[PDB]
Amino acid sequence: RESAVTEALARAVRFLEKARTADGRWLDFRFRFVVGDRDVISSQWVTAYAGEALARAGAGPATLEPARDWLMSHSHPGGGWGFSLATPADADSTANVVRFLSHWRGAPEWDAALGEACAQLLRYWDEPGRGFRTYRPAERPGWASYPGSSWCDIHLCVTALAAEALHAAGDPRHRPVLEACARLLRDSQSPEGFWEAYWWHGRTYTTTHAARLLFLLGDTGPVTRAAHWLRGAQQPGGGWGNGTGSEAAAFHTALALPVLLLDGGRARHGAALDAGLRWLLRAQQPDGSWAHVPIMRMPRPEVHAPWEDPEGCLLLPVLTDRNRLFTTATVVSALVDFLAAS
């Protein structure tokens, strides 16, 4: 029923609203890096991702504007955004900012800010490779984004989101970049129908973003293949895990459902969608959040294909969002997709 889903969405929105600092920040992915004595925690990246999800969920100006304004007043001085101001900037955090700022398209001042944010994202564009590099190689000084590091490779997870971001920003001049990204993703899809990720412990994350990019360009064959793969991956109790064998989790379920909604929604995948939705409804915590599982991997800089050795490739243990803000935002996005479906 639309009602049970509307209620779950409202509870999740409230969870995220209450977690925001007064000055506009959502903080998550706290962890201890290999070098440096104290914890890092994501500000810019998480704030943009949460903000974008809340924008799609129809959160009001009181919720959204402080986060937008915080990002605008807390960009990296060299340009763009990153994990936090204490890290380098990166294409993925910058792409998330672009996608969030796209919600103010049509206001000339925001059109200008959006255009600037896109130009910052394009500093990570590699025309010969047809994709985006997460980190730009910096020759000098303990963050592992130095020349030849796999942290500065073209990454498919980032490429898909960056292309989605440029699509949302709406500038027709970016269409050749979009098309090139889409060609790389089309060429990189597994025969089974998933995509691998660099930064994500699983086959669900790239799949959601790549499928959606190809959907936006009207290239739906890859989408059908992805949805077919997800149909098989669905666990007996109706949730999805990571697509490399893990048990059902909220994050992965929220990544799977949108792809089915792009491949005929209830007219083709009704039973699978209903089971995934019920899984999310039963799993929601009293506070309106969903429980985290380990989702974000940081590979050793010498490892270029972490997907071939998920457990063995790691610089540090696979990261979760201990505040549940990234996981919950992902679920919010999926519920919005549901409520939009016939």
Interface with Cl ion, residue 47, by CB under 5 A: no
Which residues ranging from 87 to 146 are in contact with Cl ion (CB under 5 A)?
none
**Shortest spacing between CB 9 and Cl ion, in angstroms:** 29
Interface with Cl ion, residue 327, by CB under 5 A: no
- Nearest CB to Cl ion, comparing residues 84 and 208: 84
- Nearest CB to Cl ion, comparing residues 46 and 101: 46
**Shortest spacing between CB 313 and Cl ion, in angstroms:** 28
Tokens representing 331 are: 């679920």
Cα dihedral 98, 318, 323, 53, rounded to 10, equals 30
> Of 42, 47, 63, 84, which one interacts with Cl ion (CB under 5 A)?
84
- Nearest CB to Cl ion, comparing residues 63 and 84: 84
Residue 296: helix, strand or coil by DSSP? Answer: strand
| Candidates 79-87, 150-158, 201-209, 296-304; binding stretch for Cl ion (CB under 5 A) | 79-87
**Shortest spacing between CB 32 and Cl ion, in angstroms:** 17
- Nearest CB to Cl ion, comparing residues 85 and 340: 85
Kindly determine how many residues on this chain lie close enough to bind Cl ion according to the rule CB under 5 A.
3
**Shortest spacing between CB 162 and Cl ion, in angstroms:** 21
Instruction: Report the residue numbers after which the chain has a gap, meaning the C atom sits over 2.5 angstroms from the next written residue's N, or none.
Output: 141
Residue 114 near residue 159, CB atoms below 8 Å? no
**Cα atoms in the 13 Å half-sphere on the side-chain side of 306:** 29
The three state secondary structure string of 160-188 is HHHHHHHHHHCCHHHHHHHHHHHHHHHHH
- Nearest CB to Cl ion, comparing residues 44 and 159: 44
Q: What is the chain's alpha carbon radius of gyration, rounded to the nearest angstrom?
A: 19
| Candidates 14-22, 82-90, 234-242, 300-308; binding stretch for Cl ion (CB under 5 A) | 82-90
| Amino acid letter, residue 290 | W
Query: Within 10 A of 59 (CB to CB), how many other CB atoms are there?
Result: 20
**Shortest spacing between CB 30 and Cl ion, in angstroms:** 12
**Shortest spacing between CB 316 and Cl ion, in angstroms:** 20
- Nearest CB to Cl ion, comparing residues 26 and 199: 26
Closest CA to 254 of 270, 239, 269: 239
| Burial class (CB within 10 angstroms; exposed 0-12, middle 13-18, buried 19+) of 139 | exposed
Closest CA to 237 of 203, 278, 265, 209: 278
**Shortest spacing between CB 50 and Cl ion, in angstroms:** 15
- Nearest CB to Cl ion, comparing residues 8 and 67: 67
Closest CA to 101 of 80, 122, 77, 85: 80
> Of 24, 26, 29, 43, which one interacts with Cl ion (CB under 5 A)?
43
- Nearest CB to Cl ion, comparing residues 87 and 206: 87
**Shortest spacing between CB 85 and Cl ion, in angstroms:** 4
DSSP line for 226-266: HHHHHHHH--TTS-B--SSSPPPBHHHHHHHHHHHHHTTHH
| Candidates 43-51, 103-111, 113-121, 270-278; binding stretch for Cl ion (CB under 5 A) | 43-51
Interface with Cl ion, residue 85, by CB under 5 A: yes
Binding residues vs Cl ion (CB under 5 A): 43, 84-85
